Amino acid sequence: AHKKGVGSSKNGRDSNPKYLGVKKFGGEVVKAGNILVRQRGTKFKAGQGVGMGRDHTLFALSDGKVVFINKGKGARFISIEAAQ
Amino acid sequence: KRTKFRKQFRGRMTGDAKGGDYVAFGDYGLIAMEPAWIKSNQIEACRIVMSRHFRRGGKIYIRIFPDKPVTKKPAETRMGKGKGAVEYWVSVVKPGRVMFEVAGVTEEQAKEAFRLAGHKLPIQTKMVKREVYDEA
Amino acid sequence: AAAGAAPRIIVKMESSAGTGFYYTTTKNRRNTQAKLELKKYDPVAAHVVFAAAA
Amino acid sequence: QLKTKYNDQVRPALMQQFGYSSVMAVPRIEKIVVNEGLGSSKEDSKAIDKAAKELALITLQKPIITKAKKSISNFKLRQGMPVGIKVTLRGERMYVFLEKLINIGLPRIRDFRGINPNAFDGRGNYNLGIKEQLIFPEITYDMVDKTRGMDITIVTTAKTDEEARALLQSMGLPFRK
Amino acid sequence: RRKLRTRRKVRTTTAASGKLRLSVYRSSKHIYAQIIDDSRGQTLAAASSAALKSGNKTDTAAAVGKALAAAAAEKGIKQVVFDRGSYKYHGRVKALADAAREGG
RNA sequence: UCACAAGGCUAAAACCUUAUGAAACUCCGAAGGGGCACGCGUUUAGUCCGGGAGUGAGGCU
RNA sequence: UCCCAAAAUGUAACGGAGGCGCCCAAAGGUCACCUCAAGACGGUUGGAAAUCGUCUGUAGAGCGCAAAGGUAGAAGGUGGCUUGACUGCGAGACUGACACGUCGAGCAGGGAGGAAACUCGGGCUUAGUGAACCGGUGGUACCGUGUGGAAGGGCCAUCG
Ligand SMILES: [Mg+2]
Ligand SMILES: [Mg+2]
Ligand SMILES: [Mg+2]
Ligand SMILES: [Mg+2]
Ligand SMILES: [Mg+2]
Ligand SMILES: [Mg+2]
Ligand SMILES: [Mg+2]
Ligand SMILES: [Mg+2]
Ligand SMILES: [Mg+2]
Structure with a gap:
């Protein structure tokens, strides 16, 4: 006549969002200590003027202007060059 | 029929047929015309139809294969x-995709074995015959 | 954390300096077995090494 | 030692045999490598002690315990535990132990008529491991416990197998024909 | 095997350091100890040892350390970074060191 | 990586030609989108401080 | 953590899979050194797999645990010395309705490793967590009800 279940899911679950990616893009002014990429790994390597926290977070060290170096795929660098 | 080990569940979407629209492994070939889904048993049906009509032995290439749960x-x-x-x-x-290849049989035999398979199929079809040397 | 705590325990590293100051971290008892001996700063002087008080 | 000079008298022998445009472009001998892979079934600390002793007393050089590559198949295997014993001999002590071998080794071998002449390192070298230990200059059954055997690997800097072969034999070596 | 050299090489932070890096090459019985401003593709000072050597083969390290550092006085170089090679900072290249490390 | 069509080859795997599926494959990879600078060119909004809210059941293509 | 998620972030479902509530006194700091899986030829126990050698070998391995990204000029394997798994702070950003959360240059005390430039305020990273309240404990001498004490509170630390 009717049915009695009984099944469910073992799924559903997921994890709260991890707002990643670059926050500071090609040709952008930058204050000292402004963050420029959140990333899982070495996706973007620090160049001149940019350091890297343990989160592999890239944060700029001395003001200036942001510049993206794509060195042919899998090896890429972000840097600051000050204006003048 | 089935795949042997996998992941489990899936989904659904469509546009025209990737590869391959061309006639390898054989002299005569049967081609979809409509964006269907095709169940094992439907092929199984076409396989058994054509296999019987050819008797021993001909040669039957069942190109398409059910990987989708x-x-x-x-x-x-x-x-x-x-x-x-x-x-x-x-x-x-998807349309244009070649479902079937048979060879080692006359044109007549091929026509028939095809038509018989066609009537067992969810979708319109067309038979054709080589020249499609996109590669080999 | 929780009571049962068989491996790893919150130990407190109290100074020899007799200042009052201490620290806290965790030791496994599988590998420390006896005691814990560490050399950290003291803010009531400058840098005087502590032992694993209960 | 003397063996070195004999190599240096094999050198114009192979220069003359092969017509080499250079004297360094002639087959030489790089290291000797002694392996002792008991383990797996022999998990005894006492036994690897004994292999250490035996090896140190014949080869006059300390031996390394080459552990398990951490491959743990269905049968008895595991992570990081003794399974083999290596002693790499090159240069002086190579020549000393090797002369000890042609001199007192294969001669004192129970039922001996040469070794396998069919090709080895088709790259151009040559190994050959050798069984029993009760056939020795230094090993005695009157200074051990059970009974074992080992592995031996030379590296002829040859370019093929005929040239390796030649070097080996004219260095003083038995080829069972 | 090239790993030691490219290792310490990248480990010398090229430009962003500011200081100048200082090559060596004691593998042969001749060396080359160059002084480089990294960034600019240019090599500043330098003091070899194959244009007469006195005679010493490895004893002369201190000599070319002192000779180099001597060139460094004139050109005006007071800051440095020690770009070793596959060379494990011990004797010879340590001599070249200590030598330049006082005779600047 | 996982799956898969005919054949070769070999003791089956690997490998060779032919051939193909993929949300949780990717050698690649658009259209589009997003950030920043200008306004090189049109137009009107914006932002902040303070008062008053209501809304938190949505509906179809 | 991955897919859904429509190549910026974000995005629901009793949608599709899988882990966590720890662990490490070395698996941390620094210094120095080493390079993987796998197949082929030949090798005493072996002989599917053991241990040795030669050749190939950009990752087809490893990273305590899930997976994703990452990584061979090391994060991977080994050794020396070690307690930065440190106090007093925090320019400036990421991120959230709030509370939270995350990254962090640089200054001081004062130390570790290095010959040194230097690096170190835990762990390749992302889970290993609990706001207040009332209470335990070590320091502190801020308040202490006529005054001087003491009970009691307050502060920093810290445990449930
Ligand atoms: Mg291409
Ligand atoms: Mg509501
Ligand atoms: Mg609602
Ligand atoms: Mg809605
Ligand atoms: Mg989008
Ligand atoms: Mg919503
Ligand atoms: Mg209450
Ligand atoms: Mg108190
Ligand atoms: Mg009190």
């Missing part, structure tokens, strides 16, 4: 509580 919820359940559990298997045959 389709599910169906239990009988009389209110939606949710889960995803349906693998009812059967389909092969997402």
